[PDB]
Design a protein around this ligand. Structure first.
Ligand SMILES: O=C(O)CCCCC(=O)c1ccccc1
Ligand SMILES: O=C(O)CCCCC(=O)c1ccccc1
Lengths: 173, 172
Protein backbone atom coordinates (compact mmCIF):
# COMPACT_ATOMS: atom_id res chain seq x y z
CA UNK A 1 0.00 0.00 0.00
CA UNK A 2 1.02 3.66 -0.16
CA UNK A 3 3.40 4.46 2.72
CA UNK A 4 3.56 8.21 2.05
CA UNK A 5 0.21 9.30 3.55
CA UNK A 6 0.32 12.22 5.98
CA UNK A 7 -2.44 10.53 7.99
CA UNK A 8 -4.23 12.77 10.52
CA UNK A 9 -7.73 12.93 11.99
CA UNK A 10 -8.49 16.35 10.49
CA UNK A 11 -7.19 18.51 7.66
CA UNK A 12 -7.06 22.25 6.94
CA UNK A 13 -7.71 24.13 3.71
CA UNK A 14 -3.97 24.19 3.00
CA UNK A 15 -3.88 20.41 3.48
CA UNK A 16 -6.71 20.05 0.96
CA UNK A 17 -4.85 22.23 -1.53
CA UNK A 18 -1.74 20.09 -0.98
CA UNK A 19 -3.91 17.04 -1.70
CA UNK A 20 -4.98 18.57 -5.02
CA UNK A 21 -1.30 18.85 -5.94
CA UNK A 22 -0.67 15.22 -4.95
CA UNK A 23 1.48 16.19 -1.97
CA UNK A 24 -0.62 15.12 1.01
CA UNK A 25 -0.72 11.40 0.19
CA UNK A 26 2.29 11.40 -2.15
CA UNK A 27 2.63 10.20 -5.71
CA UNK A 28 0.84 6.91 -5.19
CA UNK A 29 -2.35 8.27 -3.65
CA UNK A 30 -5.56 9.84 -4.96
CA UNK A 31 -5.55 13.65 -5.07
CA UNK A 32 -8.64 15.68 -4.32
CA UNK A 33 -9.92 17.95 -7.09
CA UNK A 34 -8.40 21.41 -7.07
CA UNK A 35 -9.67 24.95 -7.41
CA UNK A 36 -13.24 25.31 -8.60
CA UNK A 37 -13.94 21.58 -8.26
CA UNK A 38 -12.82 21.36 -4.60
CA UNK A 39 -16.06 21.40 -2.61
CA UNK A 40 -14.65 21.52 0.96
CA UNK A 41 -12.58 23.89 3.07
CA UNK A 42 -11.70 21.44 5.85
CA UNK A 43 -12.09 17.85 6.97
CA UNK A 44 -13.09 17.97 10.62
CA UNK A 45 -13.01 14.26 11.45
CA UNK A 46 -11.80 10.97 10.00
CA UNK A 47 -12.06 7.83 12.12
CA UNK A 48 -11.25 4.38 10.77
CA UNK A 49 -13.53 2.37 13.08
CA UNK A 50 -16.22 5.04 13.30
CA UNK A 51 -19.64 5.71 11.92
CA UNK A 52 -22.88 3.81 11.75
CA UNK A 53 -21.25 0.52 10.64
CA UNK A 54 -17.86 0.74 12.42
CA UNK A 55 -16.25 0.86 8.95
CA UNK A 56 -15.36 4.56 8.78
CA UNK A 57 -16.72 8.04 9.42
CA UNK A 58 -15.71 11.27 7.69
CA UNK A 59 -17.07 14.76 8.30
CA UNK A 60 -16.11 17.87 6.31
CA UNK A 61 -17.21 21.47 5.87
CA UNK A 62 -17.52 24.10 3.17
CA UNK A 63 -17.77 27.74 4.20
CA UNK A 64 -20.42 29.60 2.20
CA UNK A 65 -20.24 33.20 0.99
CA UNK A 66 -22.30 34.88 -1.76
CA UNK A 67 -19.38 35.09 -4.21
CA UNK A 68 -18.53 31.39 -4.54
CA UNK A 69 -18.21 30.80 -8.27
CA UNK A 70 -21.20 28.49 -8.70
CA UNK A 71 -23.75 31.00 -7.38
CA UNK A 72 -23.26 33.48 -10.23
CA UNK A 73 -23.79 30.92 -12.98
CA UNK A 74 -26.36 28.62 -11.34
CA UNK A 75 -28.61 30.42 -11.97
CA UNK A 76 -28.45 34.00 -13.21
CA UNK A 77 -31.12 35.69 -11.10
CA UNK A 78 -31.57 32.65 -8.80
CA UNK A 79 -28.34 31.64 -7.01
CA UNK A 80 -28.31 28.13 -5.53
CA UNK A 81 -25.45 25.72 -5.01
CA UNK A 82 -25.66 22.89 -7.58
CA UNK A 83 -26.76 19.73 -5.82
CA UNK A 84 -24.42 17.82 -8.13
CA UNK A 85 -21.45 19.53 -6.46
CA UNK A 86 -22.57 18.56 -2.96
CA UNK A 87 -22.98 15.02 -4.26
CA UNK A 88 -19.48 15.27 -5.71
CA UNK A 89 -18.09 16.42 -2.36
CA UNK A 90 -19.35 13.15 -0.91
CA UNK A 91 -17.70 11.13 -3.70
CA UNK A 92 -14.52 13.19 -3.12
CA UNK A 93 -14.53 12.23 0.56
CA UNK A 94 -15.08 8.52 -0.12
CA UNK A 95 -12.06 8.44 -2.43
CA UNK A 96 -10.02 10.50 0.03
CA UNK A 97 -10.76 8.00 2.81
CA UNK A 98 -9.57 5.12 0.62
CA UNK A 99 -6.33 6.99 0.01
CA UNK A 100 -6.04 7.93 3.69
CA UNK A 101 -5.92 4.21 4.51
CA UNK A 102 -3.05 3.80 2.03
CA UNK A 103 -5.04 2.91 -1.07
CA UNK A 104 -3.02 3.37 -4.25
CA UNK A 105 -4.26 4.95 -7.43
CA UNK A 106 -6.43 7.67 -8.83
CA UNK A 107 -10.01 8.09 -7.68
CA UNK A 108 -13.07 7.60 -9.87
CA UNK A 109 -16.66 7.76 -8.70
CA UNK A 110 -18.52 4.61 -9.76
CA UNK A 111 -22.04 5.77 -8.96
CA UNK A 112 -24.66 6.05 -6.25
CA UNK A 113 -27.77 4.10 -5.31
CA UNK A 114 -30.17 6.94 -4.62
CA UNK A 115 -30.01 10.67 -3.98
CA UNK A 116 -32.76 12.81 -2.45
CA UNK A 117 -32.60 16.62 -2.42
CA UNK A 118 -35.05 18.29 -0.02
CA UNK A 119 -33.52 21.75 0.45
CA UNK A 120 -30.98 24.15 -0.93
CA UNK A 121 -27.77 26.03 -0.19
CA UNK A 122 -28.36 29.75 -0.70
CA UNK A 123 -25.77 32.57 -0.65
CA UNK A 124 -26.89 33.57 2.88
CA UNK A 125 -25.85 30.21 4.34
CA UNK A 126 -22.69 29.96 6.42
CA UNK A 127 -21.72 26.27 6.61
CA UNK A 128 -22.27 23.18 4.50
CA UNK A 129 -21.51 19.92 6.33
CA UNK A 130 -20.80 16.58 4.68
CA UNK A 131 -21.22 13.36 6.70
CA UNK A 132 -20.01 10.00 5.33
CA UNK A 133 -20.73 6.63 6.99
CA UNK A 134 -18.91 3.75 5.34
CA UNK A 135 -20.61 0.42 4.73
CA UNK A 136 -17.87 -1.47 2.93
CA UNK A 137 -14.18 -0.79 2.41
CA UNK A 138 -12.16 -3.07 0.13
CA UNK A 139 -8.44 -2.36 0.54
CA UNK A 140 -7.00 -5.37 -1.30
CA UNK A 141 -6.51 -5.94 -5.04
CA UNK A 142 -9.14 -3.54 -6.42
CA UNK A 143 -9.70 -0.75 -3.92
CA UNK A 144 -13.29 0.39 -3.53
CA UNK A 145 -15.59 1.97 -0.96
CA UNK A 146 -19.35 2.11 -0.45
CA UNK A 147 -20.89 4.65 1.93
CA UNK A 148 -24.05 6.55 2.79
CA UNK A 149 -23.78 10.32 3.06
CA UNK A 150 -25.72 13.43 3.97
CA UNK A 151 -25.29 17.11 3.20
CA UNK A 152 -26.46 19.69 5.73
CA UNK A 153 -26.70 23.46 5.48
CA UNK A 154 -26.37 25.35 8.76
CA UNK A 155 -27.27 22.21 10.67
CA UNK A 156 -30.26 21.04 8.59
CA UNK A 157 -30.14 17.93 6.39
CA UNK A 158 -30.91 18.82 2.78
CA UNK A 159 -29.41 15.95 0.74
CA UNK A 160 -29.17 12.23 1.39
CA UNK A 161 -27.26 9.70 -0.69
CA UNK A 162 -27.21 5.95 -0.26
CA UNK A 163 -24.58 3.60 -1.66
CA UNK A 164 -22.09 6.17 -2.89
CA UNK A 165 -19.39 4.10 -4.61
CA UNK A 166 -15.81 5.11 -5.48
CA UNK A 167 -12.85 3.09 -6.71
CA UNK A 168 -9.12 3.72 -6.90
CA UNK A 169 -7.28 2.70 -10.07
CA UNK A 170 -3.53 2.54 -10.56
CA UNK A 171 -4.03 2.80 -14.35
CA UNK A 172 -7.04 4.47 -16.00
CA UNK A 173 -5.85 4.43 -19.63
CA UNK B 1 -48.64 27.95 -18.61
CA UNK B 2 -45.96 30.16 -20.18
CA UNK B 3 -46.86 31.42 -23.67
CA UNK B 4 -43.47 33.14 -24.17
CA UNK B 5 -41.49 29.98 -25.04
CA UNK B 6 -39.52 30.12 -28.27
CA UNK B 7 -40.49 26.50 -28.89
CA UNK B 8 -38.42 24.57 -31.45
CA UNK B 9 -37.33 20.94 -31.82
CA UNK B 10 -33.62 21.77 -31.50
CA UNK B 11 -31.51 24.55 -30.02
CA UNK B 12 -28.10 26.02 -30.80
CA UNK B 13 -25.34 27.16 -28.47
CA UNK B 14 -26.62 30.72 -28.80
CA UNK B 15 -30.11 29.54 -27.79
CA UNK B 16 -28.65 27.86 -24.70
CA UNK B 17 -26.82 31.04 -23.74
CA UNK B 18 -30.08 32.96 -24.22
CA UNK B 19 -31.73 30.41 -21.91
CA UNK B 20 -29.13 31.07 -19.23
CA UNK B 21 -30.09 34.76 -19.41
CA UNK B 22 -33.80 33.95 -19.10
CA UNK B 23 -34.56 35.00 -22.68
CA UNK B 24 -35.43 31.75 -24.46
CA UNK B 25 -38.50 30.88 -22.36
CA UNK B 26 -39.10 34.36 -20.97
CA UNK B 27 -39.73 35.55 -17.44
CA UNK B 28 -41.89 32.66 -16.27
CA UNK B 29 -39.69 29.77 -17.38
CA UNK B 30 -36.69 27.90 -15.98
CA UNK B 31 -33.31 29.14 -17.22
CA UNK B 32 -30.43 26.78 -17.90
CA UNK B 33 -27.22 27.31 -15.94
CA UNK B 34 -24.77 29.70 -17.53
CA UNK B 35 -21.10 29.58 -18.35
CA UNK B 36 -19.07 27.11 -16.32
CA UNK B 37 -22.18 25.22 -15.17
CA UNK B 38 -23.66 24.83 -18.67
CA UNK B 39 -22.82 21.26 -19.67
CA UNK B 40 -24.17 21.21 -23.27
CA UNK B 41 -23.45 23.02 -26.53
CA UNK B 42 -26.66 22.10 -28.35
CA UNK B 43 -29.97 20.33 -27.98
CA UNK B 44 -30.24 18.15 -31.07
CA UNK B 45 -33.78 16.85 -30.60
CA UNK B 46 -36.81 17.27 -28.37
CA UNK B 47 -39.89 15.09 -28.92
CA UNK B 48 -43.08 15.53 -26.92
CA UNK B 49 -44.36 12.07 -25.95
CA UNK B 50 -41.32 10.50 -27.67
CA UNK B 51 -38.68 8.17 -26.35
CA UNK B 52 -38.74 4.70 -24.86
CA UNK B 53 -41.89 5.28 -22.77
CA UNK B 54 -43.66 7.68 -25.17
CA UNK B 55 -43.57 10.32 -22.43
CA UNK B 56 -40.86 12.62 -23.81
CA UNK B 57 -37.38 12.55 -25.32
CA UNK B 58 -34.44 14.96 -25.29
CA UNK B 59 -30.97 14.56 -26.77
CA UNK B 60 -28.11 17.03 -26.36
CA UNK B 61 -24.39 17.19 -27.11
CA UNK B 62 -21.25 18.69 -25.57
CA UNK B 63 -18.17 19.15 -27.73
CA UNK B 64 -14.96 18.17 -25.96
CA UNK B 65 -11.73 20.14 -26.16
CA UNK B 66 -8.75 20.29 -23.78
CA UNK B 67 -9.58 23.86 -22.67
CA UNK B 68 -12.83 22.99 -20.88
CA UNK B 69 -12.35 24.33 -17.38
CA UNK B 70 -13.05 21.14 -15.44
CA UNK B 71 -10.17 19.17 -17.00
CA UNK B 72 -7.49 21.40 -15.48
CA UNK B 73 -8.67 21.01 -11.89
CA UNK B 74 -10.14 17.50 -11.90
CA UNK B 75 -7.56 16.15 -11.37
CA UNK B 76 -4.21 17.92 -11.64
CA UNK B 77 -2.09 15.63 -13.81
CA UNK B 78 -5.07 13.31 -14.48
CA UNK B 79 -7.85 15.09 -16.39
CA UNK B 80 -11.32 13.56 -16.45
CA UNK B 81 -14.72 15.19 -16.79
CA UNK B 82 -16.47 15.06 -13.40
CA UNK B 83 -19.24 12.49 -13.53
CA UNK B 84 -21.30 14.82 -11.34
CA UNK B 85 -21.40 17.36 -14.19
CA UNK B 86 -22.67 14.80 -16.70
CA UNK B 87 -25.32 13.84 -14.17
CA UNK B 88 -26.16 17.53 -13.81
CA UNK B 89 -26.48 17.91 -17.58
CA UNK B 90 -29.22 15.28 -17.41
CA UNK B 91 -31.03 17.11 -14.59
CA UNK B 92 -30.61 20.36 -16.58
CA UNK B 93 -32.31 18.74 -19.59
CA UNK B 94 -35.23 17.37 -17.56
CA UNK B 95 -35.96 20.85 -16.20
CA UNK B 96 -35.55 22.41 -19.64
CA UNK B 97 -38.11 19.98 -21.08
CA UNK B 98 -40.62 20.95 -18.39
CA UNK B 99 -40.14 24.61 -19.31
CA UNK B 100 -40.27 23.81 -23.03
CA UNK B 101 -43.80 22.46 -22.49
CA UNK B 102 -44.69 25.78 -20.86
CA UNK B 103 -44.05 24.90 -17.23
CA UNK B 104 -43.50 27.93 -15.02
CA UNK B 105 -40.95 28.27 -12.26
CA UNK B 106 -37.31 27.75 -11.41
CA UNK B 107 -35.76 24.33 -11.82
CA UNK B 108 -34.49 22.27 -8.90
CA UNK B 109 -33.24 18.70 -9.08
CA UNK B 110 -35.09 16.50 -6.61
CA UNK B 111 -32.82 13.47 -6.82
CA UNK B 112 -32.05 10.34 -8.79
CA UNK B 113 -32.23 6.59 -8.42
CA UNK B 114 -29.31 4.38 -9.36
CA UNK B 115 -26.41 5.99 -11.21
CA UNK B 116 -23.60 3.89 -12.70
CA UNK B 117 -20.39 5.30 -14.17
CA UNK B 118 -18.45 2.74 -16.23
CA UNK B 119 -16.12 4.93 -18.29
CA UNK B 120 -14.71 8.39 -18.59
CA UNK B 121 -14.55 11.53 -20.72
CA UNK B 122 -10.92 12.44 -21.43
CA UNK B 123 -9.76 15.67 -23.12
CA UNK B 124 -9.02 13.85 -26.41
CA UNK B 125 -12.65 12.78 -26.75
CA UNK B 126 -14.70 14.56 -29.40
CA UNK B 127 -18.32 14.64 -28.28
CA UNK B 128 -20.49 13.74 -25.29
CA UNK B 129 -24.13 12.80 -25.89
CA UNK B 130 -26.95 12.98 -23.35
CA UNK B 131 -30.13 10.97 -24.01
CA UNK B 132 -33.18 11.52 -21.76
CA UNK B 133 -36.19 9.19 -21.89
CA UNK B 134 -39.05 10.54 -19.80
CA UNK B 135 -41.22 8.22 -17.76
CA UNK B 136 -43.66 10.74 -16.25
CA UNK B 137 -44.41 14.44 -16.65
CA UNK B 138 -46.71 16.20 -14.16
CA UNK B 139 -47.62 19.68 -15.36
CA UNK B 140 -50.24 20.76 -12.79
CA UNK B 141 -50.08 21.81 -9.13
CA UNK B 142 -46.55 20.51 -8.43
CA UNK B 143 -44.60 20.34 -11.68
CA UNK B 144 -42.24 17.37 -11.87
CA UNK B 145 -40.46 15.26 -14.46
CA UNK B 146 -39.09 11.75 -13.94
CA UNK B 147 -36.77 10.27 -16.57
CA UNK B 148 -34.02 7.79 -17.28
CA UNK B 149 -30.80 9.07 -18.80
CA UNK B 150 -27.69 7.88 -20.58
CA UNK B 151 -24.39 9.61 -21.24
CA UNK B 152 -22.17 8.49 -24.11
CA UNK B 153 -18.72 9.62 -25.18
CA UNK B 154 -17.97 9.24 -28.89
CA UNK B 155 -20.80 6.71 -29.13
CA UNK B 156 -19.82 4.56 -26.09
CA UNK B 157 -22.25 4.49 -23.15
CA UNK B 158 -20.42 5.50 -19.99
CA UNK B 159 -23.11 6.66 -17.53
CA UNK B 160 -26.64 5.52 -16.79
CA UNK B 161 -29.13 7.14 -14.45
CA UNK B 162 -32.50 5.74 -13.40
CA UNK B 163 -35.34 7.96 -12.13
CA UNK B 164 -33.85 11.42 -12.48
CA UNK B 165 -36.35 13.79 -10.83
CA UNK B 166 -36.64 17.55 -11.35
CA UNK B 167 -39.30 20.00 -10.20
CA UNK B 168 -40.23 23.55 -11.17
CA UNK B 169 -40.93 26.03 -8.37
CA UNK B 170 -42.39 29.51 -8.86
CA UNK B 171 -41.35 30.44 -5.29
CA UNK B 172 -38.16 29.05 -3.78
O1 LIG C 1 -28.85 21.80 -8.17
C1 LIG C 1 -29.99 21.41 -7.98
O2 LIG C 1 -30.90 21.52 -8.95
C2 LIG C 1 -30.35 20.86 -6.62
C3 LIG C 1 -30.36 22.08 -5.71
C4 LIG C 1 -30.96 21.83 -4.33
C5 LIG C 1 -32.34 21.17 -4.41
C6 LIG C 1 -33.41 22.16 -3.99
O3 LIG C 1 -33.23 23.36 -4.11
C7 LIG C 1 -34.72 21.66 -3.44
C8 LIG C 1 -35.10 20.35 -3.65
C9 LIG C 1 -36.31 19.88 -3.13
C10 LIG C 1 -37.13 20.73 -2.41
C11 LIG C 1 -36.75 22.05 -2.20
C12 LIG C 1 -35.54 22.52 -2.72
O1 LIG D 1 -15.95 12.27 -11.64
C1 LIG D 1 -15.83 11.09 -11.34
O2 LIG D 1 -15.16 10.76 -10.24
C2 LIG D 1 -16.41 10.03 -12.24
C3 LIG D 1 -15.73 10.13 -13.60
C4 LIG D 1 -16.33 9.17 -14.62
C5 LIG D 1 -16.28 7.72 -14.16
C6 LIG D 1 -14.93 7.13 -14.51
O3 LIG D 1 -14.02 7.86 -14.84
C7 LIG D 1 -14.70 5.66 -14.44
C8 LIG D 1 -15.66 4.83 -13.88
C9 LIG D 1 -15.44 3.46 -13.82
C10 LIG D 1 -14.25 2.93 -14.30
C11 LIG D 1 -13.28 3.76 -14.86
C12 LIG D 1 -13.51 5.13 -14.93
Amino acid sequence: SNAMVDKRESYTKEDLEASGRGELFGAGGPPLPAGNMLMMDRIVKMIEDGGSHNKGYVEAELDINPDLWFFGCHFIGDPVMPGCLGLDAMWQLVGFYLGWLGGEGKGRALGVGEVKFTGQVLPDAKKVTYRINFKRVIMRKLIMGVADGEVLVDGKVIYTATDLKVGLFKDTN
